[PDB]
Amino acid sequence: MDIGKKLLEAARAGHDDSVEVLLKKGADINAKDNSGRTPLHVAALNGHLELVKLLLEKGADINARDMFGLTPLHTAASNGHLELVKLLLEKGADINARDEDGSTPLHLAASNGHLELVKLLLEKGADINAEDHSGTTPLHFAAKNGHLELVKLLLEKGADINASDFSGPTPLHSAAENGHLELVKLLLEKGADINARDKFGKTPFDLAIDNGNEDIAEVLQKAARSH
Amino acid sequence: MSMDIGKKLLEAARAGHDDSVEVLLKKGADINAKDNSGRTPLHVAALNGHLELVKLLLEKGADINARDMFGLTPLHTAASNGHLELVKLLLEKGADINARDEDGSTPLHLAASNGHLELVKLLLEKGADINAEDHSGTTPLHFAAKNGHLELVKLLLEKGADINASDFSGPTPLHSAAENGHLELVKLLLEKGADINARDKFGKTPFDLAIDNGNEDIAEVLQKAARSH
Structure with a gap:
């Protein structure tokens, strides 16, 4: 019972x-x-x-x-x-x-x-x-x-x-997502926003991880820590 | 033959x-x-x-x-x-x-x-x-x-x-109020400073959403707000 x-x-x-x-x-x-x-x-x-x-x-x-x-x-x-x-x-x-x-x-x-x-x-x-x-x-x-x-x-x-929640991807999002390491470094040096959120609320770092871009994720992670 | x-x-x-x-x-x-x-x-x-x-x-x-x-x-x-x-030639001819x-x-x-x-350089020039x-x-x-x-x-940044x-954004409260035909809410949001130019995920304004849903009174109010400026 x-x-x-x-x-x-x-x-x-x-x-x-x-x-x-x-x-x-x-x-x-x-x-x-x-x-x-x-x-x-x-x-x-x-x-x-x-x-x-x-x-x-x-x-x-x-x-x-x-x-x-x-x-x-x-x-x-x-x-x-x-x-x-x-x-x-x-x-x-x-x-x-x-x-x-x-x-x-x-x-x-x-x-x-x-x-x-x-x-x-x-x-x-x-x-x-x-x-x-x-x-x-x-x-x-x-x-x-x-x-x-x-x-x-x-x-x-x-x-x-x-x-207004999230936004569309920034250039740093695109560069990170598509594995363009030197581009990511340039964008960071020129002041791209590491905290930017794309349409799913993701950062360039999240996208770097999603695509298996280890080097980019490390560089982005380093940027986050500096601030 | 034919050609x-x-x-x-x-x-x-x-x-x-x-x-x-x-x-x-x-x-x-x-x-x-x-x-x-x-x-x-x-x-x-x-x-x-x-x-x-x-x-x-x-x-x-x-x-x-x-x-x-x-x-x-x-x-x-x-x-x-x-x-x-x-x-170069096309631009020179208008x-x-x-x-x-x-x-x-x-x-x-x-x-x-x-x-x-170099082509982008020329276009910018x-x-x-x-x-x-x-x-x-x-x-x-x-x-x-x-x-x-x-x-x-590098050049574009220069x-x-x-x-x-970052293109567009997600909808604002003014978007939702307009889309769902809440006229008094729209009036209140506007007086409290809601952004009439805000763009949703398709790049649409609250006014666009109002027309899309056939909310004429709301669209008129938003239009008056826009024209006011």
Whole structure:
């Protein structure tokens, strides 16, 4: 009889009484379903605050990751559960945790227009200009999804209004990528930007590595250290 | 038997047979006849570096700025193929030095891509835009660096090429707001100083995205912002 599965279902449907019973029967409090979600994840999802208090006190992992790298805090913030987010932060949740796509809880809360929840996150030290793996910030999602007041807040709190993620490759990118060593040295001496990011957010150094250009990568690495 | 004389003129010009070209022109072949790719005798002659044949074509009134199917001018193809004396002649007879083909490439783009140093020197001397962007936002320096032409890159940098040229960017919040028809958000972003000239990954402005999505009110607001300046 799979009691971990029963624990997960009870946690999701918010049956505190069944959760108590199953945990007493030795159910794994950090049992993971097929998507890697723990009882804490699914309880956080449906805003079951008291159940989350019980799970945390009984040893649930606050920073557990599902297969997408989402923490319970991600899910609570995404679904606009303010008090639940307060609780998670008080119990040691990582406010700048990033999922598989590089999204922070602030990203998700901004995307869904949860104004007060965003206020709380910023108060508790959320990075307002955090970029996901696509180089996009919470302000991008708030503007894209038409959350006007939320955009006002982000701008008031110092979000970059012209945040534009990455750029196209610079000449140093091209030279590094195509293994032109002497060209790379010339570009560096003439002041090319070693920190430039191409359309995937990559530096000339990353591209040198991707293409197996050991000598170029060393020269670029040396440049990085000098600064 | 049958043989179109314009096609004979094109074949002769491509193979560099000045004597056949002279005869065909006297017999009334169209000096600006185009092949199936839109190339004129001037194009195909510039391609194979037939200088005297290009001189004859020009003196007999060839269209120096004719365009092939790719929007390439004779100057484009002479520059790309590194025919320096031929490029001199074309420029002297009025070729547009900053002409752009279908992809937004200028003659300097193509000469730089192939590392034709003295040819690039000449183009710059005659006023080529060293920081010209093609439709991808790419500059001549990009192509020289990418294709590994060291001395060309040295020259371009000497002549003021932007060493950190990076074309376009990802979309700004103003882009997203305009693309998704959020008018009040657009108005707010503008008053708070959003950049109306910002270009997204395809080089488009927020105004372009507004038109693309049929958001007229937003496009009008962005237009008023642009005109304001």
